[PDB]
Design an enzyme around this catalytic site. Structure first.
Site, PDB file in Angstrom:
ATOM      1  N   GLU A 111       0.826  -1.203   0.000  1.00  0.00           N
ATOM      2  CA  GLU A 111       0.000   0.000   0.000  1.00  0.00           C
ATOM      3  C   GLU A 111       0.863   1.256   0.000  1.00  0.00           C
ATOM      4  O   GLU A 111       0.531   2.248  -0.649  1.00  0.00           O
ATOM      5  CB  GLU A 111      -0.943   0.006   1.205  1.00  0.00           C
ATOM      6  CG  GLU A 111      -2.070  -1.008   1.110  1.00  0.00           C
ATOM      7  CD  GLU A 111      -2.893  -1.085   2.381  1.00  0.00           C
ATOM      8  OE1 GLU A 111      -2.352  -0.769   3.463  1.00  0.00           O
ATOM      9  OE2 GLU A 111      -4.081  -1.459   2.299  1.00  0.00           O
ATOM     10  N   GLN A 112       1.970   1.207   0.735  1.00  0.00           N
ATOM     11  CA  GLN A 112       2.920   2.311   0.762  1.00  0.00           C
ATOM     12  C   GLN A 112       3.546   2.484  -0.617  1.00  0.00           C
ATOM     13  O   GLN A 112       3.819   3.602  -1.054  1.00  0.00           O
ATOM     14  CB  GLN A 112       4.003   2.070   1.815  1.00  0.00           C
ATOM     15  CG  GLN A 112       4.992   3.215   1.971  1.00  0.00           C
ATOM     16  CD  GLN A 112       4.374   4.440   2.617  1.00  0.00           C
ATOM     17  OE1 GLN A 112       3.372   4.344   3.324  1.00  0.00           O
ATOM     18  NE2 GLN A 112       4.970   5.602   2.376  1.00  0.00           N
ATOM     19  N   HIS A 132       4.179   4.166   9.053  1.00  0.00           N
ATOM     20  CA  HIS A 132       2.778   3.793   8.892  1.00  0.00           C
ATOM     21  C   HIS A 132       2.635   2.274   8.834  1.00  0.00           C
ATOM     22  O   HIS A 132       1.547   1.735   9.028  1.00  0.00           O
ATOM     23  CB  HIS A 132       2.186   4.425   7.628  1.00  0.00           C
ATOM     24  CG  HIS A 132       1.782   5.858   7.794  1.00  0.00           C
ATOM     25  ND1 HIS A 132       0.540   6.232   8.258  1.00  0.00           N
ATOM     26  CD2 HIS A 132       2.453   7.009   7.547  1.00  0.00           C
ATOM     27  CE1 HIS A 132       0.464   7.551   8.296  1.00  0.00           C
ATOM     28  NE2 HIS A 132       1.611   8.046   7.869  1.00  0.00           N
ATOM     29  N   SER A 192       8.520   3.409   6.002  1.00  0.00           N
ATOM     30  CA  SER A 192       7.416   4.206   6.524  1.00  0.00           C
ATOM     31  C   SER A 192       6.955   3.680   7.877  1.00  0.00           C
ATOM     32  O   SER A 192       6.747   2.479   8.044  1.00  0.00           O
ATOM     33  CB  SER A 192       6.247   4.206   5.536  1.00  0.00           C
ATOM     34  OG  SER A 192       5.127   4.894   6.068  1.00  0.00           O
ATOM     35  N   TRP A 200       0.587  17.496   9.743  1.00  0.00           N
ATOM     36  CA  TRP A 200      -0.575  16.615   9.817  1.00  0.00           C
ATOM     37  C   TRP A 200      -0.205  15.176  10.171  1.00  0.00           C
ATOM     38  O   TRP A 200      -1.081  14.341  10.390  1.00  0.00           O
ATOM     39  CB  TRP A 200      -1.344  16.639   8.493  1.00  0.00           C
ATOM     40  CG  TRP A 200      -0.591  16.055   7.337  1.00  0.00           C
ATOM     41  CD1 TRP A 200      -0.604  14.754   6.924  1.00  0.00           C
ATOM     42  CD2 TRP A 200       0.282  16.751   6.439  1.00  0.00           C
ATOM     43  NE1 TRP A 200       0.207  14.599   5.827  1.00  0.00           N
ATOM     44  CE2 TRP A 200       0.763  15.810   5.509  1.00  0.00           C
ATOM     45  CE3 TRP A 200       0.703  18.080   6.333  1.00  0.00           C
ATOM     46  CZ2 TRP A 200       1.645  16.153   4.486  1.00  0.00           C
ATOM     47  CZ3 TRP A 200       1.578  18.420   5.316  1.00  0.00           C
ATOM     48  CH2 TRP A 200       2.039  17.460   4.407  1.00  0.00           C
ATOM     49  N   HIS A 201       1.092  14.889  10.227  1.00  0.00           N
ATOM     50  CA  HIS A 201       1.558  13.545  10.552  1.00  0.00           C
ATOM     51  C   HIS A 201       2.011  13.452  12.005  1.00  0.00           C
ATOM     52  O   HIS A 201       2.877  14.209  12.445  1.00  0.00           O
ATOM     53  CB  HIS A 201       2.701  13.134   9.620  1.00  0.00           C
ATOM     54  CG  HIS A 201       3.179  11.731   9.829  1.00  0.00           C
ATOM     55  ND1 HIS A 201       2.863  10.701   8.969  1.00  0.00           N
ATOM     56  CD2 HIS A 201       3.949  11.186  10.800  1.00  0.00           C
ATOM     57  CE1 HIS A 201       3.420   9.583   9.400  1.00  0.00           C
ATOM     58  NE2 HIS A 201       4.085   9.851  10.510  1.00  0.00           N
ATOM     59  N   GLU A 252       5.683  18.362   7.980  1.00  0.00           N
ATOM     60  CA  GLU A 252       4.337  17.809   7.862  1.00  0.00           C
ATOM     61  C   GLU A 252       3.555  17.981   9.159  1.00  0.00           C
ATOM     62  O   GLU A 252       3.640  17.143  10.055  1.00  0.00           O
ATOM     63  CB  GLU A 252       4.392  16.328   7.482  1.00  0.00           C
ATOM     64  CG  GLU A 252       5.014  16.058   6.127  1.00  0.00           C
ATOM     65  CD  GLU A 252       4.859  14.614   5.693  1.00  0.00           C
ATOM     66  OE1 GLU A 252       4.307  13.810   6.473  1.00  0.00           O
ATOM     67  OE2 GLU A 252       5.288  14.287   4.570  1.00  0.00           O
ATOM     68  N   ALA A 310       7.483   8.490   2.192  1.00  0.00           N
ATOM     69  CA  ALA A 310       8.585   7.581   2.487  1.00  0.00           C
ATOM     70  C   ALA A 310       8.578   6.377   1.553  1.00  0.00           C
ATOM     71  O   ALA A 310       7.520   5.923   1.115  1.00  0.00           O
ATOM     72  CB  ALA A 310       8.523   7.125   3.936  1.00  0.00           C
ATOM     73  N   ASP A 366      -2.338  10.098  10.203  1.00  0.00           N
ATOM     74  CA  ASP A 366      -2.405  11.278   9.364  1.00  0.00           C
ATOM     75  C   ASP A 366      -3.730  11.925   9.744  1.00  0.00           C
ATOM     76  O   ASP A 366      -4.781  11.290   9.664  1.00  0.00           O
ATOM     77  CB  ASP A 366      -2.399  10.895   7.886  1.00  0.00           C
ATOM     78  CG  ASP A 366      -0.999  10.791   7.316  1.00  0.00           C
ATOM     79  OD1 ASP A 366      -0.060  11.332   7.939  1.00  0.00           O
ATOM     80  OD2 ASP A 366      -0.834  10.168   6.247  1.00  0.00           O
TER      81      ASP A 366
END
Ligand SMILES: [Cl-]
Ligand SMILES: [Cl-]
Ligand SMILES: [Cl-]
Ligand SMILES: [Cl-]
Ligand SMILES: [Cl-]
Ligand SMILES: [Cl-]
Ligand SMILES: [Cu+2]
Ligand SMILES: [Cu+2]
Ligand SMILES: [Mg+2]
EC number: 3.4.13.22
Lengths: 190, 190
Positions: free
Chosen positions: A66-67, A95, A93, A155-156, A153, A88, A102
């Site tokens: 997905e990344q 995530h 990542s 928002w992260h 960022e 990334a 996010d």
């Protein structure tokens, strides 16, 4: 299980590392998945700030595939230069361990990858006041691109837990700087 | 590659069936993935209707684990009765083949994430008038619960491609009824 795990370009996700358990996270327009502790602390944070009607969970856990698809999408959408600054590489990542979130404004068309919105908003200002008290840090702060390898960022956010989030935020540190601080401190006892 | 594949309780997804090719879909806050062909038609549909600002892509592809987490969240939050009507069992959801989309309006508050608000709008009415021309059907229509095993879901759309979407919609059929129709038709040539 290490909530402090450092993941970046120089420290990629461990291939031998076991996939974390995930649950569906509340307060999100989409179906977002996170580690149980993170999802619970996220919910507590939103309710405590009273931002149930203002902020939303845009993204959470992402697999390596997905990344990769995200990176490829950004490449055609915004180009190589912009993608490398904000997205990334697959396997690098945070995530991918379900510890990263996010956040976006509740009303919005574009995500902050496109037309930045969250920064200096009323919801963000109140969010930035209590986020460290619930285990979250601003992962990629302003004027820290040299250290993180990622542009600013707002928002992260990254879950590290207490009191780590309070310590890092108070010193205006990055996770990289925190690990260096911990490394130096340990060597003092050696 | 079989856009007509029937996935329900009676026809579960084979565990040895390889996952579909996936790309990041537009109009989804960079968080929803779909079959490449589906994502393309989804983009062409919302562009022709001019709903880029009105409607959003809530959910798309979901693994069995993700479908399980969705089921468990709904059960805990909304109860069994609600969850049965609107959530498909893990391994029997058509979201697991990347051909199903859940659409919601950007224009309303709250979540009702499992049953996104998509009915009272003029944007919804416009969507219902052109969606079949781009390969999509309303998967769970009203008064079709006995056939689908799922209650009325004006937000959930299934990609079957052309001209199947036009044929099904014109006859006001379900995917189940479409498969029965094809089955009976073929046996006339035997
Ligand atoms: Cl995946
Ligand atoms: Cl380029
Ligand atoms: Cl480093
Ligand atoms: Cl792929
Ligand atoms: Cl019904
Ligand atoms: Cl059937
Ligand atoms: Cu992020
Ligand atoms: Cu759906
Ligand atoms: Mg996923």
């Amino acid at each position: 299980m290490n909530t402090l795990q450092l993941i970046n370009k120089n420290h990629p996700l461990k291939k031998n590392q076991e996939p974390p358990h995930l649950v569906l996270a509340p307060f999100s327009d989409h179906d977002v998945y996170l580690q149980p502790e993170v999802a619970k602390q996220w919910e507590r944070l939103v309710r405590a700030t009273g931002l149930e009607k203002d902020i939303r969970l845009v993204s959470g856990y992402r697999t390596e595939k997905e990344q990769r698809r995200l990176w490829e999408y950004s490449l055609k959408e915004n180009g190589l230069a912009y993608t490398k600054q904000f997205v990334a590489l697959p396997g690098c990542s945070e995530h991918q361990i379900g510890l990263a979130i996010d956040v976006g404004l509740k009303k919005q068309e574009d995500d902050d990858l496109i037309c930045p919105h969250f920064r200096d908003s009323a919801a963000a200002d109140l969010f930035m006041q209590q986020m460290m008290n619930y285990g979250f840090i601003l992962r990629y702060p302003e004027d820290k691109q040299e250290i993180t390898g990622i542009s600013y960022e707002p928002w992260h956010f990254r879950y590290v837990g207490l009191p780590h989030s309070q310590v890092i935020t108070a010193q205006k540190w990055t996770l990289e700087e925190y690990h260096d601080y911990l490394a130096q401190t340990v060597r003092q006892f050696a």
